[PDB]
C-alpha cells in the first residue's frame, strides 16, 4: 500500500491549493517557484523520461532549501491536479500526466494533524 493517508492528504492538498491560486504546475513554473523560494513543498513524478527533469528538480530542492515527495506515477499527478477529461457517466478517462508540482502556499482548511502527516513524507 502506498499508505492511503499519504495519497489522500496529497490529494486534498493539491486540490485545495489548486482551487486557491497558490499551486504551481510545470517545469518552467516549478523552476522559478523553487528558485524564488516561494514553494513551501514540492512533488516529483518518478516515472518519466529525461534524466534531467528528476535530477535537476531534486537537486534544486536541495540547492536552495525545499522538501520533496516522490510519487510513482504521473497520471496520478494529473488526476490530483484535477487535470482529467471527464465522461458524462462521471468516469475519468483522459489524464495528462504531470512531472513536477510546486505548492506556493497552503489553504487554511488544512488540518493540523494532516499537516503533521505531510511533514513525515517530505524527506530531502
Amino acid at each position: 500500500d502506498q499508505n492511503q493517508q499519504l495519497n489522500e492528504v496529497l490529494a486534498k492538498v493539491i486540490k485545495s491549493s489548486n482551487c486557491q491560486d497558490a499551486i504551481s504546475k510545470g517545469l518552467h513554473e516549478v523552476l522559478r517557484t523553487i528558485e524564488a523560494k516561494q514553494a513551501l513543498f514540492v512533488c516529483v513524478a518518478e516515472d518519466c523520461d529525461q534524466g534531467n527533469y528528476v535530477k535537476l528538480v531534486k537537486a534544486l530542492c536541495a540547492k536552495n532549501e525545499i522538501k520533496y515527495v516522490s510519487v510513482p506515477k504521473r497520471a496520478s499527478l494529473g488526476e490530483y491536479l484535477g487535470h482529467f477529461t471527464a465522461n458524462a457517466k462521471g468516469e475519468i478517462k483522459k489524464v495528462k500526466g504531470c512531472s513536477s508540482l510546486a505548492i506556493r502556499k497552503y489553504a487554511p482548511e488544512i488540518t493540523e494533524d494532516e499537516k503533521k502527516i505531510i511533514e513525515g513524507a517530505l524527506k530531502a
Binding site: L31, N52, A59
Partner: protein, 93 residues
Amino acid sequence: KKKKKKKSYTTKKKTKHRHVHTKLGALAFYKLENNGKVSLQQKGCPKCGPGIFMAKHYDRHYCGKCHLTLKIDAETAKKNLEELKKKQDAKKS
C-alpha cells in the same frame, strides 16, 4: 437607400505571431555537475533574479517580466551577430 459594397482587397493578408515554445526547454537554463551542484548558465534579472532568467539576444539582455534591457559592449554584439548569422545561413539552406 445605400448598401454595403462587396469587399475589395488592396494589400496582401498578414499573419500573426504564433508562440515559439521549445519543449521541455526550461532545462536549458540549469546544468549539473557530479557533486550535484546547481549551475546557472543563463543570466538572471537583477530585479527579478532568483527564478527568472533574462534573454540573451546578441546585443541585449532582456527580461520577460520587467522588460529590463541591458545593452552589451558592441564587440561582443558584432561577434555574436556574425556567428548567429553564419549559422542561420547554414540551417535555412
